[PDB]
Amino acid sequence: KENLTQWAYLALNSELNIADGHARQALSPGQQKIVNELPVLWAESEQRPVQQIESEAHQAYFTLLGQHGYPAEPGRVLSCYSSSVSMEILARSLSASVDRVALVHPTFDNIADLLRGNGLDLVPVEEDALHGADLSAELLSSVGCVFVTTPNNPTGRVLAEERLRRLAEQCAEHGTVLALDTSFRGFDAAAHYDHYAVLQEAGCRWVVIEDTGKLWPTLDLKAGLLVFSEDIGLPVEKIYSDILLGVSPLILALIREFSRDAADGGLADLHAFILHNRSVVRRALAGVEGVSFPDPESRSSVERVAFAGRTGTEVWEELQRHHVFALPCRQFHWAEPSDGDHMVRIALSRSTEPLEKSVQVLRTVLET
């Protein structure tokens, strides 16, 4: 298994999948009511111009999460099948004019595998240095792009506004591209200050990749949103049009409707449900010997756990035998895999029952 997706494949057909980060819990009542009008949404998607549906979907999802200054003129937000598709467009776009990319480490490994597969070299930036300290002028001058995941995956760490401001400002000095993956944006209110405000204010060249997938159990019906400053001067628009005409108006209508249910109280319900499920795993494992939780303040839908006397791979292997699937964290540490030798990632975007089943099996594996 050469990336976390190949580990996650093994989980997809198991009742005890706690590996991939997609939302697989039950629909709420308000979400089921949306599913129930799909034949009506379908007809609306046949009948209306996609540009109207698309605008309403973007307006609903950005405002929902505080990004009021998002560029709303047609063309500026590029709807992609997935955040990974948005990522490939950007990585291939960079490769034309950039050699090296400074990337937060750790982070989800397909970000690095895509950047490398498109010919970019990476220089890692540990999280401490990223947040708690400016970045070295020797660094910025040697890279064409800076790339942050916030909320990060697997750590949940949020880039504070103050530091986002400084970072965009540093990038403006060097004419460097500043890129953000905000897939997890909706789980943590610390991420809902208007990033398009600080970004457009610094006036650097910037790219943001939003994602609607993680948040709601939509059966992987979703969009990645690629937003770029007017001065990006990367060929993201042409490469986008090489790949797709657009996304399905029905998926867009569904984003709109799920965004509106989130704004009528569904997002608070979701933050609570994720908190409950985080409590449930911590309740069952903090008292075990060796077990610590390194992201004590994470609000993300995935949770890391650390053990002191065995390797995260070995926990994975022992877990498999009882039909439970999580992720070994080595590969999140894409620049030094050993950094994640003693950790596994657990998915919380699951209904509480099979989650509890899984951690109790995790308990027993650890008490061996």
Ligand X SMILES: Cc1ncc(COP(=O)(O)O)c(/C=N/[C@@H](CCCNC(=N)N)C(=O)O)c1O
Positions that interact with a copy of itself (CB under 8 A):
2-3, 5-6, 8-9, 12-13, 20, 22, 26-27, 35-36, 38-39, 42, 45-46, 49-52, 81-82, 84-85, 88, 92, 110, 113-114, 117-118, 217, 219-221, 238-239, 241-251
Cβ pair 198, 187 in contact under 8 A:
no
Q: How far is the CB of 343 from a copy of itself (least distance, A)?
A: 21
Phi, psi angle pair for 228, to nearest 5°: -145, 145
Q: How far is the CB of 82 from a copy of itself (least distance, A)?
A: 6
Residue 358, number of CB atoms within 10 A of its CB: 27
**118 or 298: CB nearest a copy of itself:** 118
Cα-based distances in Å from 255 to 56, 137, 139, 182, 284:
9, 41, 39, 16, 35
Phi, psi angle pair for 182, to nearest 5°: -115, 35
Q: How far is the CB of 241 from ligand X (least distance, A)?
A: 6
- Span interacting with ligand X, options 80-88, 127-135, 164-172, 251-259, rule CB under 6 A: 80-88
How far is Cα of residue 355 from the mean position of the Cα atoms in its chain?
Answer: 21
Q: How far apart are CA 75 and CA 228, in angstroms?
A: 10
Looking at beta carbons, which residue is closest to ligand X?
Answer: 21
Residue list 242-271, contact with ligand X (CB under 6 A): 242-245
Residue 231 labelled as part of a binding site: no
Question: Looking at the chain, how many residues does it have?
Answer: 368
**6 or 36: CB nearest ligand X:** 6
Residue 25 tokens read as: 């819990």
Tell me which residue of 225, 206, 252, 213 sits closest to 80, measured CA to CA. 225
**152 or 331: CB nearest a copy of itself:** 331
Taking residues 167 to 196 in sequence order and writing x for each that binds ligand X by CB under 6 A, - otherwise, the string is: --------------x-x-------------
Among ligand X, a copy of itself, none, partner that 213 touches (CB below 5 to 8 angstroms by kind): ligand X
**174 or 294: CB nearest ligand X:** 294
Q: How far is the CB of 22 from ligand X (least distance, A)?
A: 6
User: Quick one: which of 67, 79, 95, 149 contacts ligand X (CB under 6 A)?
Assistant: 149
Cβ pair 183, 301 in contact under 8 A:
no
- Span interacting with ligand X, options 81-89, 136-144, 310-318, 353-361, rule CB under 6 A: 81-89
For position 20 contacting ligand X by CB under 6 A, the verdict is yes
Q: How far apart are CA 134 and CA 296, in angstroms?
A: 24
For position 17 contacting ligand X by CB under 6 A, the verdict is no
Residue 109 labelled as part of a binding site: yes
Q: How far is the CB of 25 from ligand X (least distance, A)?
A: 14
Number of alpha carbons in the 13 Å side-chain half-sphere of residue 269: 16
Q: How far apart are CA 332 and CA 8, in angstroms?
A: 13
Residue 302 tokens read as: 């995935």
What contacts 24+ positions apart, CB below 8 Å, involve 125-130? 127/152, 127/155, 127/157, 130/104, 130/159
Helix (H, G, I), strand (E, B) or coil at 123: strand
Alpha-carbon torsion, ordered 30, 274, 11, 318, to 10 deg: -150
Among ligand X, a copy of itself, none, partner that 9 touches (CB below 5 to 8 angstroms by kind): a copy of itself
Could you tell me how many residues of this chain bind ligand X (CB under 6 A)?
22
Phi, psi angle pair for 187, to nearest 5°: -80, -15
Residue list 213-232, contact with ligand X (CB under 6 A): 213, 222
Site for ligand X, rule CB under 6 A: 5, 8, 20-22, 82-84, 108, 110, 149, 153, 181, 183, 211, 213, 222, 241-245
Indicate the annotated binding residues.
109, 113
Indicate the annotated binding residues for Mg(2+).
109, 113
